[PDB]
Amino acid sequence: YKFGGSNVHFGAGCDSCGVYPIIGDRYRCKDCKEEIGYDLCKDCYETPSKVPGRFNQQHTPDHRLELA
Amino acid sequence: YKFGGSNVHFGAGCDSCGVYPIIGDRYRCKDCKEEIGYDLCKDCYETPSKVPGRFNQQHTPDHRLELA
Ligand SMILES: [Mg+2]
Ligand SMILES: [Mg+2]
Ligand SMILES: [Zn+2]
Ligand SMILES: [Zn+2]
Ligand SMILES: [Zn+2]
Ligand SMILES: [Zn+2]
């Protein structure tokens, strides 16, 4: 069981706007190799901006994201 | 970013043993239709017989669990 379902992502923060926990849809990077990973909230996902990551992930526009 | 990586699943509990949060690998049911979902810790996952769920998920042995 997981409380809140996909409406909340406990422990996940948005690397663009910094919101934590992400509320609503979460998009996680499939290609970032850093253990901390890389994530965006839906709003930041819809508006592509320059964000390599708040924790030195060096995410690029060529990486693939997926709804989590 | 997601603190703890895959070593911790905040907000997720094991429907068999009750550990919360699940630490270590997490196995999520692909077929339980209920929004709360169904999850197991690795130790309860390795046991072939599967509990129906602590939140009335009525999980059945037919259902398939995936590594999350
Ligand atoms: Mg906050
Ligand atoms: Mg506990
Ligand atoms: Zn954001
Ligand atoms: Zn990335
Ligand atoms: Zn367990
Ligand atoms: Zn199930």
* Residue B54 · residue B36 · CB < 8 Å: no
User: Resolution in A, one decimal?
Assistant: 1.7
DSSP H/E element including A28: strand A26-29
**Letter string b/e over residues A19-41, b meaning 16 or more CB atoms within 10 A of that residue's CB:** ebbbeebbbbbeebeeebbbbbb
B40 in A contact zone (CB under 8 Å): no
Does B11 sit within 8 Å of A8, measured CB to CB? yes
d(CA B52, CA B61): 9
Does B9 sit within 8 Å of A55, measured CB to CB? no
What sign results for the dihedral spanned by CA atoms A65, B3, B4, B9? negative
Q: Which of B2, B36, B38 to mutate to test the interface with A (most CBs of A within 10 A)?
A: B2
Distances (CA, A) of B7 to A52, A62, B25, B41, B68: 24, 27, 7, 11, 11
Which residue reads 């997981």 in tokens? A2
- Tell me the technique behind this structure: X-ray
CA-CA-CA-CA dihedral for B48, B49, B53, B58, to nearest 10 = 110
Structure token digits, residue B50: 């599967």
In order, the DSSP letters of B8-64 are: EETTB--TTT--SSEES-EEEESS--STT--EEEHHHHHSSS----TTS----TTS-
